[PDB]
Amino acid sequence: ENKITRHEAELLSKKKIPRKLMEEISTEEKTRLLKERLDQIYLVNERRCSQAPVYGESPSELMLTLCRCGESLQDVIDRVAFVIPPVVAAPPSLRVPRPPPLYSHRMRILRQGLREHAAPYFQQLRQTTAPRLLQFPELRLVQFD
Amino acid sequence: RIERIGAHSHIRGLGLDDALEPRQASQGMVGQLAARRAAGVVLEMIREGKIAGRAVLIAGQPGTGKTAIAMGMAQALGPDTPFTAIAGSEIFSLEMSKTEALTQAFRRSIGVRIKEETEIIEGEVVEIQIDRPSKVGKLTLKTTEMETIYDLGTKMIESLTKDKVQAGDVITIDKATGKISKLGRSFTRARDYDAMGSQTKFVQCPDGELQKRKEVVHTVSLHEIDVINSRTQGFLALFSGDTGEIKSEVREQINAKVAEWREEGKAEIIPGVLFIDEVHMLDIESFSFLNRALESDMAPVLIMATNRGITRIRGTSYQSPHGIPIDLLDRLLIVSTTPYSEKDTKQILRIRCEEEDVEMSEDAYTVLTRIGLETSLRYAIQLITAASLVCRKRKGTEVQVDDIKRVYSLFLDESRSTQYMKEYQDAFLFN
Amino acid sequence: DVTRIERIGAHSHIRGLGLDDALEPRQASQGMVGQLAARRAAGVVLEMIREGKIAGRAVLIAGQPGTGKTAIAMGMAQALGPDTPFTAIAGSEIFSLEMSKTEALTQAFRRSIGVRIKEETEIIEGEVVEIQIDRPSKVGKLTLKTTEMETIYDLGTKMIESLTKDKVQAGDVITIDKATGKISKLGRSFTRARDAMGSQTKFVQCPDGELQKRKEVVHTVSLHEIDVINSRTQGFLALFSGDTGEIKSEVREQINAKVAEWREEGKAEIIPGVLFIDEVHMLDIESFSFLNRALESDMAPVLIMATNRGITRIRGTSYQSPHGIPIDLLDRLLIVSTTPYSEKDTKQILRIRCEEEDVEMSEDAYTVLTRIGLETSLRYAIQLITAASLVCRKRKGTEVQVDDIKRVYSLFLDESRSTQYMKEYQDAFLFN
Amino acid sequence: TQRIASHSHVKGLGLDESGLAKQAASGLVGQENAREACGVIVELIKSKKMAGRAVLLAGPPGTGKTALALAIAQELGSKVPFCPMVGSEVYSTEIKKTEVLMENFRRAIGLRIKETKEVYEGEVTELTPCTISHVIIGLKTAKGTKQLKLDPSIFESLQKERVEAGDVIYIEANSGAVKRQGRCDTYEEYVPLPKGDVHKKKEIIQDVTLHDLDVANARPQGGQDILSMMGQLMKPKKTEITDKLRGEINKVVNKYIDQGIAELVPGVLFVDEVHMLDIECFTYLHRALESSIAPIVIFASNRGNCVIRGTEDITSPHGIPLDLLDRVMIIRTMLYTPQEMKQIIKIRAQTEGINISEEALNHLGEIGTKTTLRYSVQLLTPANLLAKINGKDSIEKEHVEEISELFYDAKSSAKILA
Amino acid sequence: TQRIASHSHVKGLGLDESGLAKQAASGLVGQENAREACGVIVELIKSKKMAGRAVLLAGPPGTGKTALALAIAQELGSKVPFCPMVGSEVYSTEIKKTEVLMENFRRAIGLRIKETKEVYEGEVTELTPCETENPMGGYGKTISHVIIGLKTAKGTKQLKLDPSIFESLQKERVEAGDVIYIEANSGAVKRQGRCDTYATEFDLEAEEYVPLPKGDVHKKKEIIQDVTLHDLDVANARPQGGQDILSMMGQLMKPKKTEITDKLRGEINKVVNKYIDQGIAELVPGVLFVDEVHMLDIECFTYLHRALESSIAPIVIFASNRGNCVIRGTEDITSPHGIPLDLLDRVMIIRTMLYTPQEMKQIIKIRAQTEGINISEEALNHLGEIGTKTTLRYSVQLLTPANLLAKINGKDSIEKEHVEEISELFYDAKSSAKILA
Amino acid sequence: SGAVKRQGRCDTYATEFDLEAEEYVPLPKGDVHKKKEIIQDVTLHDLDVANARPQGGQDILSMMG
C-alpha cells in the first residue's frame, strides 16, 4: 500500500521559509536520481510557513505569602502535608507468550528516546510525584506522653 | 489607598452600647433598632463560639441597608475571625459540581491557628573569615550586652556565601533551618568603603542573649489544607483555583488529623462566619445539600439576605415565602427591616454628606430629604455627589436648592423614566 | 483523459460575473442571465469593494428559493478573482464544542481581512571546497568556491559545532544565513554529478559568482495567522490541526497596534476581504447582537448574507421578524431582492447547462423540458439533463429525444409528485 | 460458513444487459422500477464525470432500502470505495456535527497510486564499514556480488543500525531501508538468501482515502520530534481540520495526478435513516453538497410529513426541509404481494439451507400476511430447530403452530396489553 | 488612512467651557441635555473621588449612544484607559459568567509604575588591584580593592571596586574589549559583547558585537510603564518559569483560563497599596461601557449588585433600546430594558429623544464632509426626504455607492437622479417589509 | 514499597562543628532487619482506585502517566 513518505506537507522540518530551493529545482540513472528527488522535495518546498514569523514585561514581584503570618512558602507546606494513600499499586503488566521482536524493538527504541530527553531534568522531575508513604510524629508527642 | 469612597464606606460597625442598646448614631449607623439589637445578640453568640450550625435570614424591603447591616457586622467582627461573603450566582460554575463549591466555601470560612516554638539567634556580624580550599570558616557576633565567637558550618558556609552578607551587618539565623535573614544594616556595617557601593539607613544593635527560643503562631483555613495536600503539588493551584472534585476520603482524613491535633493543644480552631447574598438565586439542589451541610461540626454560622415574598422556588413552579423551601425555613430564624422614617432620613443624609465632605444649605437638606422619601433613598444618595459637582462648577461652595432642581431635571429617575417610556411606548422594542 | 477532482457542480457553468464594464448587466454573459437588478446591485457592490475605502458595510440578499442567490455570490466571488481574501461558510459552523460563538465570529472576521508584507534577506551561499577542523583556533577554510570565485574566513565555535552536528561534508553546496549563521543544509556539489554518488540525499551543483547576494521576498497573511502564531509557543501546529481556541483579546489588541505600526512604516499593506455567510437565519440572536458592534469596529471587512424567509421567529426568542432577523441589525444593512425567472431565461439557463454537460438533445426535448421545469422547478430539469444523457447513452444513440425525457420523468418523481403520492398514501409510511 | 445475516442472500440486481429487470435473480425480487432506477445511477457513478448528485430512498418499513443500497454496493464491487454511515451517529461529544459530516465526505473519496522499486537482499554475510564514495561491500554470499555508489556516510549510518553478518535487510536502494529480517543465532531463524539477481522489485497498487491523508498530516507523527516523543502517549483526540489544510491537500493531490501517477476514484457515502437529523445538519448539508468535489450521496427514510427535529413545530415530508427536499432526487418503493412473500421466504430458506414441507411454507406465508413479512421471516430458524430435537429433517405444520403459539408479534401484543 | 468607520466623523463632545453645549462641535447635533449630562460624568471621572457609580442610557433603535460614549472617551483622552464590551462576550465556554464579569472589571483599573535606576556602562579598558600587606598576618599578598578602567564613547575613567566584586566579574566573561552593565547601588554586572570596533575590520564576524556605549557612565534614568491590574493578575497567578519541566508540561497542554481565586486578588490589592503608598506606582482608574445590557441574564444582574457595591469597582456605563420586555432567563418577569427593578434602583439613567429632519440634514452634511464627497443640494433634500421616511443609517449608507456611481458617470457631485436609482436599487424597512409581504 | 527516607545525621557527629545546620539523631538500637505484622484496613473502593491510576512503579512511562 506504499509508504506515503511523500506528501506530508506538515513536518515543516526543512523550514527554509524562502522558496529559494525553487531555483535549484528549476536548475546511468543520475538524471533520474536527481529529478525524482528534486520533485519529491519541491512538493515539500510549499511548506513555507515557519519564518518571516513576526514575533514579539516582567513584573515578577514575588510569590506573596498566602496569609501565613509572615514567613511562608515552605513552613506551611512541610507543616500541613501529611496525607498518605491507603493503598499503592504497581502498573499492570500484560502477560504474552513469545512476543514479536519488532514490537520489542519499537518499544525499546521508545525506552531509549524517553531518557536523554528527560535526563537533564529527569532528576528534577523524579523528586516530584513521589507521594509520601509514612510519617514520624516528633517528641512533641512527649507533651501527652 | 487602593480603596475609594464606597456606598458602604460610611459604615464602621453597629453602634451598640455594652447592654446592646443601639445608639441613635455611632460608627456611622442608625435605624432599625430592633435589627441592631438582634445583630448585637448574633455577634455576642459568635464570640461565644460554643455552638455550631446555627443559621439566620434577613428579609425586608429592597435597598434598606441589609447589606449595610451585614457589612457593619463584618467590620465589628475584627480581622482575627475569618469571614467571607459571596453571591448566590457565583456558585454556578463550569468546572465543578455545585455541592463541591458549597463545601469549598464552608471550608474556606473556618480557620485554624497553629502554634509552635522557635529557636533562633541574631546579632552583629562582628567578623567573618572564610577559607576556600572544603571550606573552613570562622565567625563571631555580638549584641548590646556581650559578644561571642563561633565556627562556621559547611552548609552554613554555602548559605552565607550565597547570602553574600557583609561583615558588621545585623542578621538572624535559625539553627534547625539554618536560614539567615538580614534585619537591617548597622553603623559599621553600612559605613562601607571609600568606594561608593550604595547608601542605606541603619538599625539599632540587637539586645538580650543571642539565643532566644521564642514561639511563632500561624493561621490557615481548612480548604487551604485540603488543597495543599490534595494533589501533591496541587499547591500552585491554590491561586489558579483549578481545584476540582476534592475527594471525600481526603476530607475525612483531614478531619481526623485536625481533630487529634486539636485536643492535644497543638492548635486551636476558630468558627468563622459565612454570608451569602441573593440567597434566592439558589436552586432546590443547593437547598437540599446545604440543609444537611449544617450537621457537620465544622459549621460556620450562616447569614442570608433576600427581600422576596411568596416567590416561585428556583428550578420549579412552587411559590414559597422568599422562595425558600419550608424545610430550611424551620431550621432558621428571621429578622425584618422596616422602611425608614422622616427625621432619621435627615440624619442618614447628613452622615453621607460628612462622608463626602461637602457641606451645603438647610433648605437643600429639607427638599432633598422629601424628594428621596417620595422616590427612594438611593436616588438621593446618587444626587448628593452630582449636586456637589454642579455647585463646584458654579465656582461657589454652598450648594443651593436651585442647583438641586437643575441636577434632578438633568437625570430623570425611575418613575420619570417609566413615565417617559409611557410618553412614547413605541420608542423601544418588545414592550 | 485526466479526470480532475473538480467536476460538473451546481455552478461549474459559471466562470465569472460577466457583465458590462460600465456596470450594465448584459442580458446574458458568462452564465449570468436575468435578475439584471440584482446583477446591477452586485456590480456596484463589487466595484466599491475593489476601491476599498469604506469599511463596515453590510449587504443582504433576500428573495425566493432556487433563484441563484448562491449563483450570484459565486459569480461575484469569481469576479473578485484570486489573491483577494474571500471567505464563504454556512451558518451552522458558529456552534462548536470548544469556543463560544462569539470567538468563532471574531475568528471569522480576522480571517476575512488580508495582509501582505515584504522584506530583504541579503544572505550568503556557495560551495565549500573544504574546511579544516578548528583544532584548539576558529579558522575555518571557508573555501566557499562558487563557479567563479572563492575565499576563506574564520569559523566560530558555534559555526564549528553547527557544521559538525549537521555532518556537512567538504566540497558541498550550502547556504549560510548572514546574521544567524544557520547552516541551511543543501547537499553536495557537482563534483560528483553534472563521480556521481547516488543515494537518498539530495544533490546540487555549484552556484555562481557573489557568495553574498540580496533577495527581497514577500508574504501574505490574514490577521488570523498572526493571532494564532503569536498565541502560544507552537500556534503553527495548532493551525495545521485547527485545534486552537479562545485567543486572548489582549493578544489581538497588541497585534492591531503593531500591524498598524508596520503599516504606516511602509512595511505592511492591508488587503481587505469580503466575507459571505449563507443561511444567516440559522444564526442565534446573540450572533446578531454581536455583529451589531463587530462591524462598527474599524477593521470591518464588508459582509454578505443570504436568505429567502418571510416572517419568522428569532432563534432564541418568540418574536416574529422579517426573514427572522431582528429589526435592530437590519437598519445597518441594505436589501437586495430577486424575482422568479421567466420562460426565456429558463430556456437559456437550460441550454447553458446542457452545453456545460457537453450534451446534445433534440430541440423539441429542450422545449418540453422547458415546459416541465417551468411547472415543477429548475433543479428538476437540471438533474434530468444528466439523467437523460446517461439514458440515451444506454440507448446507444447520439442526441436526446423527447421519449427519453418522458421515460426518465416516469422513473423519478419530483417533489410534488411524491408529496401527493404520500398524501393519499400516508396511511402506509411511518409518522404521517 | 460465516454467521448468516439478514441481507446475505442478496448478490446483485438481476438486470439484463439492456437494463431491464428479471423478476428475481442474484438474491433479489420485486420493485423493478426501483431496481432499474438504481442501476442507472450506478452507471452514473461509473461515469465518474459528475459530482454532488443526491438521491433519497423513501419506502415503508421493511421494503428493502437497506437491501437496495447493499445491492448497489455489491454491483459496484470492492474497487469502488464504499463507506456506509449512520444518520444518528453524528451527534457526538468530541467535535461539532459539521466536522463529522465533512469527515465522512472526505473518506468517501478514494485515491489509488502506482509505482515499482529495484531492491537489495540475500547477500548479507560479509560486512565492512568501508570509507569510500561507492559501496565496496562486495556483497556476495548466496548468488552474486554487487557494487553501488554510496558515500562513506552511508556505510556508517548503515553500520549505526547494529547491522551484523548475514541478516537480510530488504534495503530498497531508493529507500536505503534497513528492513532487517532478523539475526540468525548462527551469528535459529535463518534468513533465506535467495538466488537470482539481488535487484528485485514488484509493482504495487495502493489505494488511500483523502480523509486518512488529512488525519495523517493534521497532527505530528510524534516519533519524528524528540519534543514530540510524548506525542504518542497523550490520549488521541479528533479535532477540526483547518480548511486551508484541505485546500492545501487538494493542491498537492492535483499535482500528483498531473504527474501521471495518481488516479482518483470518487466513492459513495450512504446515510441511512436521515430523518433523525436536526435542522442545523440540514442547513450545512445544503452548502456542503454544493461543493464541486462533493461525492455522490444516498439517503434513506420512511417517516411521514411529521415535525422536524429541533424545529419542534414544522412538519415536512419525512421531516425533510422543503428547500432540502427540492435539491434531492426521489425514488419510492411500494409494498409486496403474498406471492413475493412465498418467493422471498423460499430464498431465505434456501440460503439458510432449511427444508420446508410445501404445506408448511404456504401456511407460514399466510401467517406473515396476517401480521407482516419481517416477523414471519424471523421465525424460520426456530422451527428448523424444533424438527432437530425430534430428528425431523424438514419443517412441518405442527412445528410452525408450536412456534407461533410460543411467541407473539407486535400486532397481537398490541391487543394483549389492552 | 483608515476606511471610514461608523463614527470616525466624531472628534469631541464640544461642550463650552461653562459646561454648556455648543450646538454643533466635532460632529454632534441636538441632545444638548445629553451632552451636558456627559459633561457632568466626565467631570465626575476626573474628580476620582467617587467609585462604583454607573449610568444607563435609554434610547430608541439606531443606537447613537455609541457616538456619545465614544465622544466621552475622546474627551477623556488617552490619559485614562477605557474598554468596550458586548453582551454576547459573557457567554463563554471556558469560564463562568461571573468570572468574565469580575475579570472585565479588573482590567478596567489601570496603573502607572515609576521606578528609578542607576548603572555604570562602558568598555573594559583595564583592571588592576589595590595590593596591600596591611591585613593581619600571613604573606601580605592581599588586595585592598580593585581598580577598573572603563570607557564609554563619552570618555574614559576608572572607579574603586571592592575585593569581592573581582570574584563576581570572574563569574562573567569579563575580558579586555567588551562592555558591561555595572549596577551602581547593587553591583549587578554582565557581558554584552566585544567592542564593535574590532569587528569593524573583521571580514567575517559570526558573533554579534555589541556597539560602544554612549554618554556618561553614571546613568540609568527612571523607567516607566503602565498596565491593567488584570495583566498583573495573569502574570503573577501562574508563575512563568518557562525553562522548568512544568513549562514543557504546560506547552504540552493547550493553554486556557482558570477561575482566579479571590485571595490572589486581595493580595494584589495589598501589594499595590504598599507600592503606591511609597509613591513608586500610580493608579489611573478607568471606566467601562457594556452595550446591550438587555442581552444579559438574571445571574449577571444579581452578581452586578455585589460587584457594584464594592469600593474598588471602576465607573461603568450601559445602553439599551429595549422596552419593558421579559427578562432573559426569567420566564415571565418584564421590566424596562429587561433590567430588574432592584438593579435599576441603584443606577443613574439618561435618555435620548427622536431627531428632527433638520438635524438629519445637518448630520448628513457632516457625513458628506467626513467622506470628502461633494453633494448637490437636490441630493441633500431628496435624501432628507428619504431619511424622513426611512431611518438615519439607511440614508447614510447611500452616500458612498452614489458617489461611486457618479465617478462612473464622470461627474463629481451627486445629483437627484443618482439617489433615485440608488433608492430603487435598495429597499427600506417598510418597502422591504411590503415586498416581503 | 522501596520507600527511601533520611533521618538527618548521626549523633556521633554532634561536636565536629558548632553551627552546622542539619540536625542529629543517634544510631538505631535494633537490628537492621525487622518484619512486623499490622492489622491494616481498607475499602474495596480504594483498592479499585489505587489499581486504576498506577502511582506506584517507577518506569518513566508510568511517571509520565
Ligand SMILES: Nc1ncnc2c1ncn2[C@@H]1O[C@H](COP(=O)(O)OP(=O)(O)O)[C@@H](O)[C@H]1O
Ligand atoms: N439605616 C442606614 N444607615 C446607613 N446607611 C444605610 C441605611 N440603610 C441603607 N443604607 C445605605 O443604603 C444601602 C442599602 O442597600 P441594601 O438594602 O443593603 O441592598 P440590598 O437590598 O441588596 O441588601 C446600604 O448599602 C447602605 O450604604
Ligand SMILES: Nc1ncnc2c1ncn2[C@@H]1O[C@H](COP(=O)(O)OP(=O)(O)O)[C@@H](O)[C@H]1O
Ligand atoms: N441567472 C442564473 N444563471 C445561471 N444559473 C442560475 C441562475 N439562477 C439560478 N441558477 C442556478 O440555480 C442553482 C442554485 O441556485 P441557488 O443560488 O441555490 O438559488 P437560491 O439561492 O435561491 O437557493 C445554481 O446551480 C445556478 O446554476
Ligand SMILES: Nc1ncnc2c1ncn2[C@@H]1O[C@H](COP(=O)(O)OP(=O)(O)O)[C@@H](O)[C@H]1O
Ligand atoms: N425484492 C426483494 N428481494 C429481496 N429482499 C427483499 C425484497 N423486498 C424486500 N426485501 C427484504 O426486506 C427487508 C427490508 O429491510 P430494511 O431495508 O432494513 O427495511 P427498509 O427496506 O424498510 O429500510 C430486507 O431484509 C430485504 O431482504
Ligand SMILES: Nc1ncnc2c1ncn2[C@@H]1O[C@H](COP(=O)(O)OP(=O)(O)O)[C@@H](O)[C@H]1O
Ligand atoms: N438612537 C439614537 N438616539 C439619539 N440620537 C441618535 C441615535 N442614533 C443616532 N443618533 C444621532 O446620529 C448621529 C450619528 O450617530 P450614528 O453614527 O448614526 O450612530 P449609530 O450608527 O449607532 O446610529 C449622532 O450625532 C447622534 O446624535
